[model samples]
Target: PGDAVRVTSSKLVTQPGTSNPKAVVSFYEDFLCPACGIFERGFGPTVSKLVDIGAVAADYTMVAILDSASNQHYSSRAAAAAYCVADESIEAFRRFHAALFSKDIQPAELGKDFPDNARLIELAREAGVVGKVPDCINSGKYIEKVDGLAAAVNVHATPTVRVNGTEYEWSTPAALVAKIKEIVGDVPGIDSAAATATS
Candidate 1:
């Protein structure tokens, strides 16, 4: 019999250093989530700085529960858009990610007013997705991968993050940086002692 252990990747942008970093940070987020928007705009830059310094590896997964009743098609389109980022490049992902969360999205008018599918394609194109959005979405390639990843991790929230496979409870950047230091041991990348140090 096979073990029932489930494997899930962090939805946070995972930038690995030259060598494989034992500690990995998993980022969980929903594209249409408002709180996620706050986190992205607030702490995202610091996280990116961490990635740049090779302090840790980042991984991402989508939590689509937000779309269940509110925005039916939003989740699917967001999932596909994420894949488009993964499929294309980190730069493209970052660009699209920022755009998705930066604006005020009305859940009630999502699929109809925003049309996540079309918007995703437009965002991809603007971010230089380099191909037809339909092709990527129709393939069901990246979407399945991210969806499977979310399920395996038992992710049920908009921005549930895991550090080294353990759920991260803190919501602030200072807390996150401290946690990373605890795992990696005195990383020079950021001064974990002071909250303002990270910024």
Candidate 2:
């Protein structure tokens, strides 16, 4: 968390980018994390807004370290579903992620169905993903990839974030953007009004 890790973007899930990119933010998270859920609702909206306007490139990596929290291997299966979307399109992955958190999937969006495959695939399809994702999730194809990548990246905790390869921290999205602004000059059409909320 002191020095920045040199990130190779090719093998990671990426966000939309600006014509002149200023920073790369990597997010380490697990689907089964309640804290990750907090991030999803709090800073996540602003993070998505920044991506929408091309303020930065975001990297998302899912870890299964929190499986015990769910006691159902939910993190592993959900991460696999994320990989299915990522293999198709990063945009699709974003939608799948959002849907996975919402009440869209099955068993109340635990992202489960047909042993956690059918509805995961349906969510992918609902996200406009085109592919063998249904079968992919059912077969559990990316478990190894998830494990390998997690190890390679030194992912030891959920909701860990890195800005421009340097491990960093921020409790809210506006603060994240404001911090980025210090490096990038300004985020066009950026608004951090959400930071004003009392929680």
Candidate 3:
């Protein structure tokens, strides 16, 4: 029998079009984390391009450690919203994820401060996840999923990524691409010469 699925106390945001993908790259991050923002803005696009072309699949797990200090309400809210997006549509979720990290996030006001959550929710609704945001947040859906993955993988830090069953100390786009190539052997759909190329 398959192992029993463990529920966690964290949330997850996963890319679409990667179900049953050749490999799954799991990332642990915090919504208010500056480093996560840097990584997303710097390398997220390239990674997105790769996924669009079927090079790799990404799974995101949210850690609300930042809420320990400032913006307690917002932190978990953001994380939960992100998970809702992932669960609804991978493509729309990717777009929403990029938008979330593209700007400076104020701990105060949370979604109200950004005004983007509404847009994100609109996207989610179109994708058939209209009311999932509240359900995910209120039910602690994001936290539970993320925590389960974290415990199983022994994750103890933000921005941690695991490729297949191997964990990495760092999760740079280049490193991720390298790992994907090693595992999948140069996926044919991905363009090697484009600026976002995986090579």
Query: Could you say which candidate leads in lDDT?
Result: 2
Residue-wise C-alpha lDDT for candidate 3, range 1-199, written one tens digit per residue: 0111111111222235743556566667766667777777767766665566666566676655555323544555566677776665555566656666766433333333432445446545654565566465456666554435445555566666667657766545566677677766656644451356321
Q: Candidate 2: which stretches are off by over 4 Å?
A: 1-20, 68-70, 103-115, 192-199
Instruction: List residue ranges in candidate 3 displaced over 4 A.
Output: 1-20, 104-153, 169-172, 189-194, 197-199
- TM-score attained by model 1: 0.73
Clashing residue pairs in candidate 3, if any? 8-144, 8-148, 9-143, 9-144, 10-142, 10-143, 10-144, 11-142, 11-143, 16-90
What C-alpha lDDT values do all the predictions have? 0.61, 0.64, 0.56
CA error at residue 37 for candidate 2, angstroms = 0.8
lDDT of 2 by residue, 109-186 (tens): 243432256767777888888587877788889766665556777888877987877888767667787877666554
Query: Which is better, 2 or 3, measured by TM-score?
Result: 2
lDDT of 1 by residue, 1-199 (tens): 0111112223222335643454577777877777787777777666666665555666766656555545655775676666665566666666666667665542443455545566667767776676645578656556555556557767778677777778777667877887787766655655733243332
Cα lDDT for residue 147, candidate 3: 39
**Per-residue error (Å), model 3, residue 77:** 1.0
C-alpha TM-score for every candidate = 0.73, 0.76, 0.66
Q: Which wins on TM-score, candidate 1 or candidate 2?
A: 2
